[PDB]
Amino acid sequence: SRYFIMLCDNETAIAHAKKTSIWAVKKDSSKRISDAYKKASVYFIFVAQQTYNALGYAQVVSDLNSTELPFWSDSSHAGGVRIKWIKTCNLFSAEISEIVSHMDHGSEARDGMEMMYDEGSRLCTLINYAIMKR
């Protein structure tokens, strides 16, 4: 399993993705994600950019496609992927936020980056736990 963070700075993008199960992948992250999709189960963990709220996580279930992008995409995006939502939420967890704060080997997460297996596993557990506690 391989895990990537999507930092959402646009409420309409996440709302649309929660309804339509498509995400737009940035040109700078697309090569790594597409390659990972061919080699492993790939998960996107969605986090709000401004607050580090947990928004959910999903499995990627199609490869990068420049011909299927959601309406909110722009010239920074290479293509879309279809996703399968596993959990959806909108909550603040200080434990989740701390992981995001240090995801770039001690520096703050960057949108589209791949995280370590341990970080992905922990984040998915923390999302499940936060949901069951709220």
Domain ranges within the chain, ordered by starting residue? 2-133
φ, ψ for residue 110, nearest 5 deg: -110, 140
Cα 58–Cα 60–Cα 65 angle in degrees, nearest 5: 135
77-91 and 114-115 as β-strands: parallel, antiparallel, unpaired?
unpaired
φ, ψ for residue 116, nearest 5 deg: -70, 155
Beta partners for 130? none
Experimental technique: X-ray
Start-to-end C-alpha separation, the chain? 27
Three-state DSSP state, 29: helix
Write out the E strands in 49-123: 54-60, 77-91, 114-115
**Domain 2-133 architecture:** Roll (3.10)
Entry resolution in angstroms? 1.5
Neighbours of 75 (CB within 10 A): 5
